[PDB]
């Protein structure tokens with residue numbers, strides 16, 4: 001009784017048809033997407049909660065997973081599952097959800113249902129439980145036709161098989177209807193007429209308008225309020241309801257400025273629901289002021305405790321990152337998920353008009369049970385077979401453990417590896433030019449395990465360091481090619497300590513370029529950032545980043561050796 005409820009989330013890569021699919025389920029029932037679509041189908045109430053784009057480090061995904069009891073993975077019948085929906089799927093498994101895989105667009109010519117089944121199944125290499133991987137039902141669809149079926153040759157005349165699968169395989173909400181009222185805010189919304197809107201799935205009890213209630217946050221603070229309106233979902237809309245009970249995904253009004261993870265409880269029996277997720281950062285990196293003599297050249301405006309507050313602004317757009325204070329009052333220890341995470345932060349921190357010095361990314365070590373541990377992660381690589389012998393030995397040098405390989409049959413091959421983040425850092429740069437830029441690479445954090453004894457091979461080559469400040473002349477640069485490749489041509493402005501090229505030998509060579517050329521080496525942010533040794537820093541400015549030593553003079557460098 002009152003358990004005909006099906007709270008399910010939906011995951012789909014762009015243009016894989018999740019808007020069309022949900023739309024068909026709506027029009028064929030008794031009732032861009034909406035955040036939640038309520039569907040009445042034969043006295044069943046199915047809530048389809050939407051998942052955000054592949055780039056949402058705010059932590060909305062895990063909030064969504066906290067409201068649903070299953071997830072709906074929509075996959076193109078030809079393209080198969082995309083690595084963009086990787087993490088959203090990962091978090092679904094992390095919340096112990098058993099997925100329902102919908103392979104739609106089955107009507108397109110060359111659709112390979114059998115193949116995309118394997119791909120999805122293999123994609124569940126997300127340390128996914130047997131329970132999750134075994135018996136995930138496969139509903140084939142053609143959303144643009146409104147047709148579904150358990151087989152793709154044998155298809156129903158409507159979306160009935162999909163409805164049935166949802167009813168059959170999605171568990172009812174694990175809630176008690178008779179307990180005292182309890183509801184955690186999962187998402188927020190606003191209406192200039194209604195005010196702040198709190199959205200979530202009622203964990204316990206019931207709620208009516210004008211009900212007296214107590215709000216308790218994650219730390220333990222409490223405040224009393226009276227709910228104004230209880231908005232239930234019906235279609236793509238929200239209507240005022242006189243009663244909402246456990247299991248219902250509803251919207252509440254007039255509780256003031258609700259914060260996410262606040263728990264709305266009956267005035268007595270105030271019980272805060274546990275704060276849910278946190279993506280522990282695995283890669284640390286230093287953000288420093290531009291100590292360089294080019295302090296305010298192109299960099300619009302930055303002092304010490306200026307960009308610091310910007311490192312207190314990105315702190316809620318993402319909780320996978322941390323920001324700590326270093327002894328150097330002009331440098332800060334900011335950590336994150338991967339290197340790509342901290343990378344793009346800079347990329348339009350640059351377009352934001354900033355200038356900063358940044359070290360090389362290092363993995364965050366953790367000591368557990370006396371044994372130090374480092375982050376390992378799963379890597380899938382898609383290269384041409386002319387590169388497979390090359391990229392294999394490369395990862396092997398980076399302490400990569402081979403787990404699986406699968407030839408394309410058409411000249412390519414997909415490789416799978418278990419590798420510590422330590423050895424994977426800055427490999428994307430080497431990888432691309434190694435595979436001539438046709439190869440592809442994807443990564444996903446797996447687990448912390450005992451550190452692999454040893455270190456990753458260092459840069460081997462030394463660097464050409466400028467001894468003074470001035471304009472680089474063609475007469476000197478031509479003589480420098482006798483000892484390696486350089487980073488600029490005639491006319492470029494350089495200072496002392498700045499690295500201008502790559503030494504042919506292993507040692508650092510202090511050279512002057514002040515007293516026609518071969519094409520200079522231009523490095524992108526990530527390409528350069530993978531070139532950096534522990535005694536160096538990248539200097540980033542809104543038009544182009546440059547490279548330098550930590551200690552600018554040759555006198556200071558000798559002391560630190």
Ligand SMILES: Nc1nc2c(ncn2[C@@H]2O[C@H](COP(=O)(O)OP(=O)(O)O)[C@@H](O)[C@H]2O)c(=O)[nH]1
Pocket residue numbers: 012013014015016017018019020021104105106107108141142143144145
């Ligand atoms: N041929 C074909 N096209 C489809 C099917 N389902 C959806 N589409 C098309 O895919 C395009 C984008 O799908 P959409 O619903 O927006 O998916 P979303 O972008 O992930 O929300 C639309 O133009 C649809 O016409 C299908 O079963 N067959």
Ligand SMILES: [Mg+2]
Pocket residue numbers: 032
């Ligand atoms: Mg669209």
